[PDB]
From a paper:
The crystal structures were obtained in the presence of formate (FMT) between Mn1 and Mn2, which completes their coordination spheres. FMTs primary location was in the active sites, between Mn1 and Mn2. In MtHISN5, IMD1 forms hydrogen bonds with FMT and water. We postulate that the carboxylate and imidazole binding sites can be used as pharmacophores for the design of selective inhibitors of plant HISN5.
Plant HISN5 catalyzes the sixth step of the HBP, in which imidazole-glycerol phosphate (IGP) is dehydrated to form imidazole-acetol phosphate (IAP). In solution, MtHISN5 forms a homo 24-mer with octahedral (432) symmetry of approx. 110 Å diameter and a total mass of 540 kDa. The dimensions of the MtHISN5 oligomer did not change significantly after the binding of IG2, indicating a lack of major conformational rearrangements. The active site of MtHISN5 (see below) contains two Mn2+ cations (Mn1 and Mn2) bound by residues belonging to different subunits.
Author numbering:
A (entry chain B), C (entry chain A), D (entry chain A), E (entry chain A), F (entry chain B): 77 to 261
B (entry chain E): 77 to 260
Write the structure that this text describes.
């Protein structure tokens, strides 16, 4: 009875395959073509207890933008498919994740209405090879296809890797809460 | 043994009857004479899983103030009665409720000491016919008779209906948490 | 064959029926339960040459918010359905509409990615009975279900009725341009 | 049949004759007694494809003000006459005209309601013998008798001749668009 | 007969071949040695309906500057050759292109007088491997050999890839408009 | 020999009938569909000694804007008709009207050139049901069809009803002066 969503989409720019189990055990199998994004998608599994499979190739010789965007769009669609009729779930999720000096709060509602409120202050332009502009775009695209209300608020942080990873930990744990069943419903 | 509180009070200005079940299933029956307040009281039921019955008539030809106040006072008293000795409950409740661009956090303690910390920025004076000054007065009056410590904090929001509705969603879910029993 | 999109949705709050003909002749048939919004929807027909049929009733005894939102959502869905595969259309639309002292520019792309950039300065809270906060929410909701990129920018204006009506005229003409066929392709 | 408007008016100060063909081929025939204004009126023909005939003499021994004003008034009246019932025309016109470093946007509506929004920053007081205060007065007077809604906005420019000429190019192209027939209606 | 311009130039730094068809069907054939610039040149084809063939190699072991510059110079020369006597063309082009949150307006005139007005605010120094200083230099060099008046103005935008891509979409559509024939003349 | 002007105009939005006697005795018969506007039009009669008849119905279910505008336009046309050749009249009018704490000066010229200079500071958005944005629009529209130069300047005032009523008293008395005959002419 596990809630599994899957999305495959091939364009001239990217080839994306995503599978997510909302009732998973934290199995991570992420090969997006973007190593830092893979590290962040691993946090979805380890902290959200989702099973997350992502396989993507794309025009990373231009930059990571199209791959990042199309992976995020596909995850949002897979999430929407896995949620089904959304009956009985908590629907709302909240979590404040510290990572050393970083502290990020995520508040979300599986509402069917896309909205991103985004207030991160990432002080460097690259983490490894990853363009830090792509963090906002990842969550914006995921919101757009999942129909999620998502608020990301940075309360502390100076290390870009810490800020982004804390965001994914908080998102993962908030999304876990929202997708879990409300025992009184 | 569901925890049910009830308050009826008739004054020269208003006639108010309130019944709340802390262990409800979200049954909403709200007819306060103020349609937007009814919509907000419905959030108490649907998001707090309270059973909420409010029936009020009043001098709404003056304005909604006396009705709004007397309904809020009665709800706080009904909540206090329903809580009884408060043994074994979580007592504290916390929730951040987004509603599109709005985000409101509610933190409360069923402490017996009334206090309202209120920091909403509602940018318009009317939602429908509802005077938005009445939002603060609703929570102040409810706090005063329930003896609740209540903190309402707006983190984002531009639409007045969204801000107020997010506040009631967060309040409902925080109050649900506070009234539920601590398993340990 | 004319491109027609139609959507009916009944909720506990609203009862909404929408039909739009992208290849219309300007037939205006708008009865949303919100008279000023009807006047604005008429601009879609008169200036966009769309055939626009909207019939809605709702919980306007609370306020106009739910009706306004559900009408906007339904129009966006009807627009999306009417566009079909979007093959051969201009896709982009641009128009600056004056209305006396008001001047509003609209730029849009039928992109499949929802985004609203909104920069109006409406100086009063009510036009008739219409809550002027509902203008932004109308376009946000329409954007969300149509998948449109939409930018609304006020360059001039002091009368709220003029500002909002100029916005709908500019939107109507930009959308007409975007939905029309590109004769070269 | 071409839409032609013609107006002659003789006062104690000026003697003005104007004929404009909205469906012209760009015939420029401008002898206002103000050489720089003639150069600007030529842009109406060359860029708007109007046929523009202006012949004026006046009390230019005082200054160019009365001639400038009476020419502008007459052009607006001729334009109004030529438009007739305005059935089937685009009615709105928009154009951004660059001239080297200058860039001026014109937005107009053949509305029947006079309004001038004017935001040029002309940095010198004379172009040749032409008093640059007369630019605003020209468009104000033309607006007043034509019943036009007209917005002129400078986005760039440092040379007064360039700024004014770009304004007339943009006006010419916007007016051409507004007076042309809408092929769909 | 299609208007085709072609230019080959070999220097000690670069080897550049360009062919452009002003009356094309959107054939994109761009291999400049700079992958992000290739992606931008593709917009010329996809949104301008030009046929754009660019093949360049160069001293990219130093940086992309010489290749970027020499490609831009060659495109401007090819455009100039293809335009011929410019008889009968619209000559002016205008377009506002959104790309999600980005919005860029381009206004241009095929005037024979080079000028670049450039007002982009690109917030990162690299898109992929592409140095974002090269955007201004690309358009400056293209302007210089084509003899174009070109104004680029950013109205919105936070993602560098979006801002630059919106600029090339707007440029492509403005240039398409300017090079197309004026049906009335 | 009384100077009487009359205007009837029926549109899809409004049905307006106006009759004004410049040589009246202050007979007021105003039913515009806007009660506060009726009160203001009564001031024209009582303070200007005009006979003022206005009968209007319109789409006041939207708001009062279209009715307000069309009544003002019709009054301006009726005024222009009543003035005839304007021979022998004072032409200029000036009056400062106090109303308790409010003080408003009106200066006008029956010039044939429309202009409104408007400097009121009305501190509330509604007087009764009347939208105070409509005051400026009333005088602007009246100016546009009458061809009047009109300057309205607030020197004092805090009560919106007082400010607007003082404006109409001052306008009425200034217009009375301007329409009266100059005994030396
Ligand atoms: Cl606003
Ligand atoms: Cl100036
Ligand atoms: Cl920059
Ligand atoms: Mn993108
Ligand atoms: Mn790490
Ligand atoms: Mn009170
Ligand atoms: Mn609601
Ligand atoms: Mn809403
Ligand atoms: Mn209107
Ligand atoms: Mn003058
Ligand atoms: Mn010149
Ligand atoms: Mn260089
Ligand atoms: Mn791209
Ligand atoms: Mn108006
Ligand atoms: Mn009074
Ligand atoms: Na943000
Ligand atoms: Na209607
Ligand atoms: Na000449
Ligand atoms: Na390529
Ligand atoms: Na003013």
């Amino acid at each position: 009875g596990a809630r599994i969503g899957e999305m495959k989409r091939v364009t001239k720019e990217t080839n994306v395959s995503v599978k997510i189990n909302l009732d998973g055990t934290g199995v991570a199998d992420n090969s997006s073509g973007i190593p830092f994004l893979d590290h962040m998608l691993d946090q979805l599994a380890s902290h959200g207890l989702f099973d997350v499979h992502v396989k993507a190739t794309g025009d990373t010789h231009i930059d990571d933008h199209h791959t990042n965007e199309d992976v995020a769009l596909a995850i949002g669609t897979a999430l929407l498919q896995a949620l089904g009729d959304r009956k009985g779930i908590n629907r709302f999720g909240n979590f404040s994740a510290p990572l050393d000096e970083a502290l990020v709060h995520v508040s979300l509602d599986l509402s069917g209405r896309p909205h991103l409120g985004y207030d991160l202050n990432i002080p460097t332009q690259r983490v490894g090879k990853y363009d830090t502009q792509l963090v906002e775009h990842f969550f914006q695209s995921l919101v757009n296809t999942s129909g999620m209300t998502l608020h990301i608020r940075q309360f502390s942080g100076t290390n870009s890797h810490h800020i982004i990873e804390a965001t994914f930990k908080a998102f993962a744990r908030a999304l876990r809460q929202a997708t879990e069943y409300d025992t009184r419903r």
